[PDB]
């Protein structure tokens, strides 16, 4: 599945992501862009058995369980499958722990690179939230 900038922005908001840990919606919608471009099935093998899943590219070592990853901690208490879906409940909430782990959104390199410091507002501009 692929979400529309607003479609996603809506869901993200409907599952308390706005300002969470001080991060405003703009940041989570942009985050999803340069990460999966709103594509639920965007997987990515890593030279470390880890595989990043979902819109937000959540790793399978610490936060997710897929079976095939050695050193698994499953902190989000969730099977990776859940990050590949028509809804972001599992992805939104499971992202809440990640952003709550130290350095903010810098957990998402694409965000640090294409979003840290811009006027994220643009990304929700037109979306009736």
């Amino acid at each position: 599945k692929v979400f529309g900038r607003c479609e996603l922005a809506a869901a993200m908001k409907r599952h308390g992501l706005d300002n969470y840990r001080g991060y405003s919606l703009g940041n989570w919608v942009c985050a999803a862009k340069f990460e999966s471009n709103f594509n639920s099935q965007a997987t990515n093998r890593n030279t470390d058995g880890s595989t990043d899943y979902g819109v937000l590219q959540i790793n399978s070592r610490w936060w997710c369980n897929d079976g095939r990853t050695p050193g698994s901690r499953n902190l989000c208490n969730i099977p990776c499958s859940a990050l590949q879906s028509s809804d972001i409940t599992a992805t939104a909430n499971c992202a809440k722990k990640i952003v709550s782990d130290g350095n903010g959104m810098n957990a998402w390199v694409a965000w640090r690179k294409h979003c840290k410091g811009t006027d994220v507002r643009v990304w929700i501009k037109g979306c009736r939230l």
Partner: antibody
Amino acid sequence: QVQLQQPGAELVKPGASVKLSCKASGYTFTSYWMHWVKQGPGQGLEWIGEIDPSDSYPNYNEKFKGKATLTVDKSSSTAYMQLSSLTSEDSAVYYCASLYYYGTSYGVLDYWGQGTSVTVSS
Amino acid sequence: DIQMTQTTSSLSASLGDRVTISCRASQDISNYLNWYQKKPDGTVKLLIYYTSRLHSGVPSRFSGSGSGTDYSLTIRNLEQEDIATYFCQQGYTLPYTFGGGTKLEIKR
């Protein structure tokens, strides 16, 4: 400045249910996860649950999946644990706590509550 | 779940001796070990996080160590409020599991 108030005692008849309550203050309620540990009589502490206030998202301990039911109320800044069908064995001191200052990967609960000693008796 | 065992349920020594509380987990939880003090008062307080990092506020007396399956809290000069029970918990994964405790007592 991070304060989980919590009612000290709570008498409960068996077969009934009690809704314990933990009220926060000193930080932004919804932006932090709430934790609850039980202390069985003459035993260790048992991690029973987790809940995110913002999207009201519980994270259970397989064991208690059915006894405890996490819930929260934002307008009041208060987490609630509801012990369903209370029984003899399930009488003890129940703590609410938080994951605040430390990185989620450390699982370090810090800033705990005082306690609620539920006593099941008819 | 991960079994957190503390072999000695009560330990005694005198106000000025060093005390060493043990804690051994089932699998390598890679330094994700925390120590909590439960005073007879009822309140619980964080003393050390991540094996040896003193939580802010604790007296340098408390010392943390270990790494792997074995860990331990070591109080240097046992004192007044130190007489309580000590728990260890793991952070490595869900569900979180804490040790059964170790109750200190003044040796007579």
